[PDB]
Amino acid sequence: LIPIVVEQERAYDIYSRLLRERIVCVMGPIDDSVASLVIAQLLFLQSESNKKPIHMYINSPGGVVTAGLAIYDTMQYILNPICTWCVGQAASMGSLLLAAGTPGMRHSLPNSRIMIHQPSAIQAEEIMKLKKQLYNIYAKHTKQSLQVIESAMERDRYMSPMEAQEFGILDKVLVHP
Amino acid sequence: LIPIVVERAYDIYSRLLRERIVCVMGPIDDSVASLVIAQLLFLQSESNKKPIHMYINSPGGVVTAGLAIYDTMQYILNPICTWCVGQAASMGSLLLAAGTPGMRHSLPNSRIMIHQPSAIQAEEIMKLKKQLYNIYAKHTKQSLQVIESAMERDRYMSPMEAQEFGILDKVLVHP
Amino acid sequence: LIPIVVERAYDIYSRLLRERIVCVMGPIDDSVASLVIAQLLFLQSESNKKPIHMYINSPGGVVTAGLAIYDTMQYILNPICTWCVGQAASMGSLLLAAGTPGMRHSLPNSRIMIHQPSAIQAEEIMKLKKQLYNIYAKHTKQSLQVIESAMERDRYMSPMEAQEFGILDKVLVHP
Amino acid sequence: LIPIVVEERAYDIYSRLLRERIVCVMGPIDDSVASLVIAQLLFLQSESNKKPIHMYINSPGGVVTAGLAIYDTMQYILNPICTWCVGQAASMGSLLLAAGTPGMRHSLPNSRIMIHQPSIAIQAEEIMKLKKQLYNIYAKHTKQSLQVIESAMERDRYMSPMEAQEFGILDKVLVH
Amino acid sequence: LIPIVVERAYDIYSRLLRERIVCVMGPIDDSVASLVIAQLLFLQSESNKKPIHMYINSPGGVVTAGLAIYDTMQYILNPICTWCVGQAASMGSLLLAAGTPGMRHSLPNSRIMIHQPSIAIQAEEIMKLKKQLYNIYAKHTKQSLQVIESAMERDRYMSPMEAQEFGILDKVLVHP
Amino acid sequence: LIPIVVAYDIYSRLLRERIVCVMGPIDDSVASLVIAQLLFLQSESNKKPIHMYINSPGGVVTAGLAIYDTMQYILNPICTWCVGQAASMGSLLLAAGTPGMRHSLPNSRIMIHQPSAIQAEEIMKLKKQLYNIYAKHTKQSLQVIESAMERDRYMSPMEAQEFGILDKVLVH
Amino acid sequence: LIPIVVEQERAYDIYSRLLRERIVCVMGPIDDSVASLVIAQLLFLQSESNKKPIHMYINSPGGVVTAGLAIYDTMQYILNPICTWCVGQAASMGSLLLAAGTPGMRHSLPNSRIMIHQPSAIQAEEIMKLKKQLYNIYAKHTKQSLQVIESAMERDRYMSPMEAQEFGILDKVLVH
Amino acid sequence: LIPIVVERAYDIYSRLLRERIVCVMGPIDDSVASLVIAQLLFLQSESNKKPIHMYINSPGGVVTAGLAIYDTMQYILNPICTWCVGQAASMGSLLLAAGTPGMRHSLPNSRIMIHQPSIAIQAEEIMKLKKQLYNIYAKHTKQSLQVIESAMERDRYMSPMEAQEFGILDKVLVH
Amino acid sequence: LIPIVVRAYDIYSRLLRERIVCVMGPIDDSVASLVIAQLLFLQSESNKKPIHMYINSPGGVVTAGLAIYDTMQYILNPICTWCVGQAASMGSLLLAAGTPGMRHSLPNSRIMIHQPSAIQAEEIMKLKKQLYNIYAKHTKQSLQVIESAMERDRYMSPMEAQEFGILDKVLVHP
Numbered sequence A: 001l002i003p004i005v006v007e008q009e010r011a012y013d014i015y016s017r018l019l020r021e022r023i024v025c026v027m028g029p030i031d032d033s034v035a036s037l038v039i040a041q042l043l044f045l046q047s048e049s050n051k052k053p054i055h056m057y058i059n060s061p062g063g064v065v066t067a068g069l070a071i072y073d074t075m076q077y078i079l080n081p082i083c084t085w086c087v088g089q090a091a092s093m094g095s096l097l098l099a100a101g102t103p104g105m106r107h108s109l110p111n112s113r114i115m116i117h118q119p120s121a122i123q124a125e126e127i128m129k130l131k132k133q134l135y136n137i138y139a140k141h142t143k144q145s146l147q148v149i150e151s152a153m154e155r156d157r158y159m160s161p162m163e164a165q166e167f168g169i170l171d172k173v174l175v176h177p
Numbered sequence B, C: 001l002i003p004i005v006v007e008r009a010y011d012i013y014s015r016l017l018r019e020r021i022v023c024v025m026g027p028i029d030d031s032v033a034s035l036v037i038a039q040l041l042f043l044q045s046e047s048n049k050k051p052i053h054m055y056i057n058s059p060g061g062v063v064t065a066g067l068a069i070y071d072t073m074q075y076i077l078n079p080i081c082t083w084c085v086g087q088a089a090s091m092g093s094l095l096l097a098a099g100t101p102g103m104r105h106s107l108p109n110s111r112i113m114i115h116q117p118s119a120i121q122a123e124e125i126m127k128l129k130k131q132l133y134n135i136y137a138k139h140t141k142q143s144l145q146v147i148e149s150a151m152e153r154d155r156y157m158s159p160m161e162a163q164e165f166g167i168l169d170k171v172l173v174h175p
Numbered sequence D: 001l002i003p004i005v006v007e008e009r010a011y012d013i014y015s016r017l018l019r020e021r022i023v024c025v026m027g028p029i030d031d032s033v034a035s036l037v038i039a040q041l042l043f044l045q046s047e048s049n050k051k052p053i054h055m056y057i058n059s060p061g062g063v064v065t066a067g068l069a070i071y072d073t074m075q076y077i078l079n080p081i082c083t084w085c086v087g088q089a090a091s092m093g094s095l096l097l098a099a100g101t102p103g104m105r106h107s108l109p110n111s112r113i114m115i116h117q118p119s120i121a122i123q124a125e126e127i128m129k130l131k132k133q134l135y136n137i138y139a140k141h142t143k144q145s146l147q148v149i150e151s152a153m154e155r156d157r158y159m160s161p162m163e164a165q166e167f168g169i170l171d172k173v174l175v176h
Numbered sequence E: 001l002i003p004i005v006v007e008r009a010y011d012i013y014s015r016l017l018r019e020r021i022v023c024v025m026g027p028i029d030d031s032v033a034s035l036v037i038a039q040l041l042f043l044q045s046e047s048n049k050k051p052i053h054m055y056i057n058s059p060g061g062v063v064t065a066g067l068a069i070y071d072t073m074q075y076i077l078n079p080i081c082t083w084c085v086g087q088a089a090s091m092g093s094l095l096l097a098a099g100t101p102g103m104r105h106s107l108p109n110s111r112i113m114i115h116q117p118s119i120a121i122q123a124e125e126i127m128k129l130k131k132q133l134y135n136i137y138a139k140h141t142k143q144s145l146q147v148i149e150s151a152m153e154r155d156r157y158m159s160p161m162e163a164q165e166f167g168i169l170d171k172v173l174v175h176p
Numbered sequence F: 001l002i003p004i005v006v007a008y009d010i011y012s013r014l015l016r017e018r019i020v021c022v023m024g025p026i027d028d029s030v031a032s033l034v035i036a037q038l039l040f041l042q043s044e045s046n047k048k049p050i051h052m053y054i055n056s057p058g059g060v061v062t063a064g065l066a067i068y069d070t071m072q073y074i075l076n077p078i079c080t081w082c083v084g085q086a087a088s089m090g091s092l093l094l095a096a097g098t099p100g101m102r103h104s105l106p107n108s109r110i111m112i113h114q115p116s117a118i119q120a121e122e123i124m125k126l127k128k129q130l131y132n133i134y135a136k137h138t139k140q141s142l143q144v145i146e147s148a149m150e151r152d153r154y155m156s157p158m159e160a161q162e163f164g165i166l167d168k169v170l171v172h
Numbered sequence G: 001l002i003p004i005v006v007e008q009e010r011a012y013d014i015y016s017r018l019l020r021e022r023i024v025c026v027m028g029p030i031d032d033s034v035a036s037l038v039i040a041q042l043l044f045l046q047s048e049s050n051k052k053p054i055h056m057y058i059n060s061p062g063g064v065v066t067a068g069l070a071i072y073d074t075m076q077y078i079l080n081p082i083c084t085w086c087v088g089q090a091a092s093m094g095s096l097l098l099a100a101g102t103p104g105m106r107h108s109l110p111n112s113r114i115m116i117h118q119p120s121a122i123q124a125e126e127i128m129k130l131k132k133q134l135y136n137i138y139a140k141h142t143k144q145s146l147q148v149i150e151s152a153m154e155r156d157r158y159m160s161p162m163e164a165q166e167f168g169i170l171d172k173v174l175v176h
Numbered sequence H: 001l002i003p004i005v006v007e008r009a010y011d012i013y014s015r016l017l018r019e020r021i022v023c024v025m026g027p028i029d030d031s032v033a034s035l036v037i038a039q040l041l042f043l044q045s046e047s048n049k050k051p052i053h054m055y056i057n058s059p060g061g062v063v064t065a066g067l068a069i070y071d072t073m074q075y076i077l078n079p080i081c082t083w084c085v086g087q088a089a090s091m092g093s094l095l096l097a098a099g100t101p102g103m104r105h106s107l108p109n110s111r112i113m114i115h116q117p118s119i120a121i122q123a124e125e126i127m128k129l130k131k132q133l134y135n136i137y138a139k140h141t142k143q144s145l146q147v148i149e150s151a152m153e154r155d156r157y158m159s160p161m162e163a164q165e166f167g168i169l170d171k172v173l174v175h
Numbered sequence I: 001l002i003p004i005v006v007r008a009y010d011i012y013s014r015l016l017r018e019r020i021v022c023v024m025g026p027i028d029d030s031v032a033s034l035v036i037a038q039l040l041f042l043q044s045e046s047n048k049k050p051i052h053m054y055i056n057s058p059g060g061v062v063t064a065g066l067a068i069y070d071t072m073q074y075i076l077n078p079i080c081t082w083c084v085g086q087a088a089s090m091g092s093l094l095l096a097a098g099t100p101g102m103r104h105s106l107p108n109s110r111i112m113i114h115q116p117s118a119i120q121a122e123e124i125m126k127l128k129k130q131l132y133n134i135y136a137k138h139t140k141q142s143l144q145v146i147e148s149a150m151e152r153d154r155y156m157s158p159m160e161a162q163e164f165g166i167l168d169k170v171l172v173h174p
Ligand SMILES: O=c1c2c(c3cccnc3n1Cc1ccc(Cl)cc1)CCN(Cc1cccc(Cl)c1)C2
Pocket: A039, A040, A043, A044, A045, A047, A074, A077
């Protein structure tokens, strides 16, 4: 099961303990219920303090686009600087959350792989309206012109942490503290 | 269910966590990696100098998840003790070999496989595999060629054989 | 089920085989490969000089099965007209471009793709995809670097753009 | 469900058995139960590496590497281990039963014993390496020869407790 | 779900356990056999002199699981009051007849069946267990083997009194 | 889910008021739970009555007879209430109610007809265990019981008061 | 939907027409039902003429080992020369059949994939006795050492047609 | 997917039945038993002295179905040639042993097992069918019952020659 | 896959032309339907030449068995019943229902009259009686012996079933 930690007294499950340290780990497929559970924690965490930084752990293959955007809007709304940390793969919407971190504060561990390409019910016009919301969100953050974003996304390939740094998805590739 | 142990009583798994022992039993997925990573970071915060103990009995699993555990192992300042019971195959043998040098152990009758099991673009399968070549070459001190070649053989190593290859350091029958 | 036409009677696909027309509709696998190869060798028996017309409306499929069809087209002496109707994808575009030079066709609203959709080791998926690079380059006249870079793009092509690349030769609305 | 006994702390009856240094191995052996038994043994040695630990075996066998991991742990810890076969001990379970401390392997009257093996994915060479690993373990504790140990495990049959005692798998057939 | 009683709060089933009552109800498998053995050994530790009460409403179960419970019943020193309510069939009716002599009860409308239902085993091995049940039945019912073998050959249930005349139980009680 | 009252689960409450709910299909698991409840309320007092709420469409014949003989064994008076349909075994546990204390609500449905692995002879010996049981509690002859149980038919609470299956019908 | 061909009037399906040219397209996964049709077709083709060549088309991923040995033995039994043709792929028991053709008559098309690696309910001793049967057969036909065959088959990899020729599995690599 | 042959047109299996060959391939059950028995009786009425051939490639099956075939083989007057291809285990090996003496064959790589593997029936009934198999085996292998029991107790396969030594067949067709 | 023989019929259609009906498998309403159709047809060709019935069955639906049994007694043809493999439940009743002197079995068959373990109890009990009678009539055993033999959960050897009265000849070859 989920292991329990004790400190002096109260007993915590391990994911509640991380939240106490101001850490929100987006480590699964992104869907409406994960968005609900992240947004609640982010909002709770600035309620503690609008200035003290908040940490996100991103090991995700992507997911539902509106759910990732619900998370994205929340990150931008809240005042805290947000550190994005990519430990597993950062793919589809997961990469969008990684690049949306506070500039200069977006990290990745050395062996992660990042992919901005989106995998393959709504109309064509609506699918295509959402794809361009990503473009612009990516161009806003990745700091790549809209066109090269498009070119990079149509390429079904992964990036290395060094590649993603050159591309502007993330800011620092560390191995040790 | 899970038994409890005692004054306070804790389930036996959380008890191992109180002893800085991190169980990595069963197949590795994103669910297991995230849970392992959380405990590793928790235990480092209690002490960046007391050793960490990983028990490994795993048939392998997702590469990115196993790599996520690998990178956390390297990141934390703590010396990490990998212990192998039963088996360590595919990503399992990589986590074991990524223990702190001189502190990677196997019980006598365990089995070790670094050969990977038989969706994404063909070039991505090759890039991830080649990241395994470098990681194994770093920690077994072998060469990339050797690593590749040995990974091409569908077979298991005895603890003795895996000690000569560089995956582990001690085959402890007794304390 | 399948309608019957008179000439003695014959189901409507066997009638196309009488007109030297072979149908590759739908996904490719080993069974389809055995059907397609048998008809191709059979039609060569009737005459190794008169052309064989091969219709393609396929999203691709097993790559080794598709290669079994490609080798058989190249093997037989008969010139082979390829006709893409509806759309072409994965192995579909390979067989389309593999037709005899000058006899590669497509209808206006066709929809062609050389990108490959996402249990064997990592290295043999590489050599397989690299075999396709060379087959594509030989028929499209492009450099391996142009082929390799193009196959990375997840997109379909128009019949006119597929002709510009060298996949097919004529975009026919009516003869 | 599981009953609760209260001593004031309240325990599930299995934890209460674990209280008395009793580890239950009832049912098939897979990776999850190997972990749960190993943790119990490792913990019970932490309590005391001198007091004996009692191990209850009613198992039809299971995954081999899971059994080898419980066996390897049994030999690692310093406590003497008393194995008790109730019901049945077949395939890997009988190896855990035979792996008790000499003079401390017991079975109940109606306790069936079987060393024959039932007939992820592995090469052929790897299944034969594991079979011979069991050939050596059984011979070490039963004191029989490899020749005897291979021939016996070739037979699809069960042993009575006394036939197992005569064989070297257990040491005491107790009625009371 | 399971109701709770208060005295401290207990689920009803754990309340029956402090009264020294163990419930063998439902099909008998290795899990059921494991709890029953644990409660029995636990009840012996609180007092090896004071009677334990067993309640049997079982339609049978795994033979080796029933034998594991039976052996535990004989091992411990406590007298065992077995109670059949609803039905006791095959391994269920064996446990009922294996209570302490003079303390095998049944409610008026209960039913008893010693007929057996029809890891897999060899022909020679199902016959060996079939013969153990004969001897076990022959012991606690005081009939000839020849009586037992033929009685189990018939696919029928008996009345409480017919089970009394046969030797499986001692008392058919309506009221205390 | 299950509500809480002040603190106990609501079903754990009714039992403290000496009430038992036989409300669902009767099987071995229901039997044990029920029968353990009955035996525990007798530990409270062998004299304060036990009330039993019955809304069941039937179930395993041995399970119902298991509860039945338990009701007979314990001394306390037992009041049976057919709040809800009493089909088959529920209707059985009803006649079993202490003479004079078998009630029902107005729109209840009662049926003694049995619904359409054993031998062919055993089922018959069971169908006849039931014949004697209603004939004992409904005061009827075995013939009228056997003939009525052939009818795939429900009784309304007044009818079954005439039959003898219950004693009082209550609106309040 | 199997097309039909006519001769004049005799209407065959596309496969019965290939059988009539003494060509048997043994493709797809090999099991007992595949074994039978292949055994029969081969046997039937010899009854028409024990001198004219027989042709096999192999596009198979492998399959049940005993079924491939049934086909193998019949290929050897019939006096006819057998021309094996690999199109697409021939792995595990497929590649064995491809190597089992008459010396100087085992072909492959330019893009075929050939593998002798065996992929990952019988005892361990006899899964190994089968593996050694494959060693001997592979070495008899490829004219390689036993040891060379063993270690080549533990490498999980495919061969190209022109490496398979160098190894001894096939003789000729045709483009026309 | 079953081919036809001409002679004037047969599916290939009926062609084999025309050649007095009866196929027993796959698991043996009541449907196999009925079809095999009907072919045996049909072949006897065509000629009660021409030999009949059986092709055995079976892992075994239901015991009563196999016995129904065994008794029919013994009933009919024809000599019966048994040919083992692939494997002959459990009831498969009994039908193979129950051929006319001197007419029991096997191919080189075949495998043979008499060990019985592990309507539902009582204990006394399995041993009844089991002892009944012992006596049929001794009957045709000329072995003693004591040899038969202990041999069938071992979970293993025989080579074609080790089975010939034991009395199951008479001949191995070596190339 | 059913073979065809030589004017070309499948192996099973061939075995009807030879006045033979084979109940090889479990008995249900569909089997009874197909069996009874054959029996009435075989009587159409002639109701004097024998009809040969092959039985390798573990039983099945009782009414379907009784439907076949009644048709057997109705048609005038003498019916040779043959048990190969086994005959249990309704299978043994169809076997014992053969014409006196013409009920056979091969040496290694097993025969069972025990009935293995929706309707009411009265109705199932009532068909048991029915089987009780049919068994007593053809084995010529008394009802008392019949019902005691079917509470027993066991099979008979062909020779044992001959002295019980379920068959007449245990033969190895003609
Ligand atoms: O941020 C808020 C917000 C609201 C609020 C209202 C009352 C008390 N506080 C509140 N706080 C602070 C807080 C306290 C406690 C916790 Cl636990 C968490 C957060 C209302 C508006 N809402 C807007 C919003 C922002 C982003 C995403 C969504 Cl979907 C919605 C923000």
